[PDB]
């Protein structure tokens, strides 16, 4: 018995972020890559994210999930232009990342639609608020580790 889930014990592989859609170019208004989303190195929750999707909690640092899902803001959910993440923490490359906002394939986490609250394992689940803003593919019931095109 005994099975890890998230936190760097699940392998989610790698996926290409320059696949589907328009592809922008390298520029600023980015944010930093680290484990933890307001944490510090070797201390971060993690979804079933690999490449694609990461939401700032405090500071201008990213790692997967964590941010109220009533309102998503910042320009898309942030995507990577011309570096492909080599970790399965969602993003945690250890560099400053230049981000984009063209239509770009992502990795999702958590069961059901994101329109809820955050689970502190790095997931979305349904909250008391409904008919809140969704992410990517709509009209379609999303589940834990779905591949969405934004």
């Amino acid at each position: 018995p005994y099975v890890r889930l998230g936190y760097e014990g699940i392998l989610n592989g790698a996926h290409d972020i320059d696949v589907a859609g328009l592809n922008g170019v390298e520029q600023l208004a980015g944010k930093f890559a680290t484990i933890g989303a307001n944490g510090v190195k070797l201390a971060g929750d993690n979804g079933t994210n690999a490449v694609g999707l990461f939401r700032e909690d405090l500071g201008d640092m990213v790692n997967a999930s964590e941010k109220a899902s009533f309102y998503f803001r910042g320009g898309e959910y942030y995507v990577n232009i011309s570096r492909t993440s080599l970790t399965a923490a969602g993003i945690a490359a250890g560099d400053e990342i230049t981000c984009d906002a063209d239509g770009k394939m992502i990795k999702f986490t958590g069961t059901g639609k994101a329109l809820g609250v955050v689970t502190h394992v790095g997931e979305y689940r349904a909250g008391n608020m409904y008919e809140k803003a969704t992410q990517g593919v709509t009209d379609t019931d999303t589940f834990i580790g779905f591949i969405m095109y934004v």
Partner: protein, 280 residues
């Protein structure tokens, strides 16, 4: 059998079921009783520490007004970590030999204290435990090194350096190999630089206490006062549990001894605490 694992045969010679203690500890790495303790509740830790302030500076010409500042903080997260050791025991053995039982508890306690210091400094984390304090803290101070100066000299030289820094220092946090090597690498005199060898100096250096923590690594010395740099929040304290209701121990006569604690770490000055690596 004709013997338990004995060298000769009991049938030939020798009787007794009374037997002395053979078990003994190896490698101490205590630092938790040195540090202050706090209770904590909650299933994760968030800490805030203050960074540098943004004030104005005038290196040239003073008549103007310095730019105002406001309290800016950076975050850390610390997930719980679990520190443990397990022992598999044979009750028949324990009851007959006699001291084993006493040794197991006192060893488990030391062992919990030992593992805790290792993870907290650093000893390989998988992103599931408390952050690696030793990495984050101040790099190697090249200034201390007078160029081609003794190892023992380095440890003396560093102690003073922390006082210039304006950080409290009561004690030296060094690696066991670095300390032995520091003692061995002394000038051209029998007398050591910390104080002569006709004084006890095995457990004190520079006239300040010595705290041995393992995994501070070779060729590194870290001055601090332990209480100040970090603080130890405890989610649940060290407790033994013993189980004969576990699946594989039940079947057998065997009893399983668990020793564990669930700990967390607070950093009250992780943005400072001076360290040096010899370049000599």
């Amino acid at each position: 059998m004709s013997q338990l694992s004995n060298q000769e045969k009991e049938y030939l010679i020798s009787k007794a079921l009374e037997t002395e203690e053979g078990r003994v500890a190896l490698a101490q790495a205590m630092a938790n009783p040195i540090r202050v303790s706090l209770d904590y509740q909650g299933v994760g830790r968030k800490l805030l520490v203050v960074d540098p302030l943004p004030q104005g500076a005038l290196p040239v010409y003073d008549k103007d007004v310095d730019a105002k500042a406001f309290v800016i903080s950076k975050r850390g997260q610390v997930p719980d970590q679990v520190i443990e050791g397990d022992r598999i025991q044979v009750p028949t053995f324990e009851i007959v030999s006699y001291p084993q039982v006493r040794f197991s508890q006192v060893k488990e306690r030391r062992f919990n204290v030992i593992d805790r210091a290792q993870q907290r400094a650093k000893a390989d984390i998988m992103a599931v435990e408390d952050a690696e304090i030793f990495s984050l803290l101040e790099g190697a101070a090249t200034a201390v090194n007078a160029v081609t100066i003794s190892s023992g000299g380095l440890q003396r030289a560093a102690l003073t350096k922390a006082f210039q820094e304006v950080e409290k220092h009561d004690l030296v946090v060094t690696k066991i190999v670095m300390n032995a090597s520091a003692f061995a690498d002394i000038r051209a005199w029998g007398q050591n630089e910390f104080d002569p060898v006709t004084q006890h100096e095995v457990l004190q250096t520079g006239l300040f206490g010595h705290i041995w923590t393992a995994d501070i690594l070779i060729s590194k010395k870290v001055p601090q006062n332990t209480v100040y740099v970090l603080a130890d929040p405890e989610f649940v304290g060290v407790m033994p549990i013993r189980q004969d209701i576990q699946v594989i121990p039940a079947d057998k006569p065997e009893e399983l001894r668990l020793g564990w604690v669930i700990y967390e770490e607070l950093g009250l000055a992780v943005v400072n605490s001076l360290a040096i690596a010899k370049i000599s």
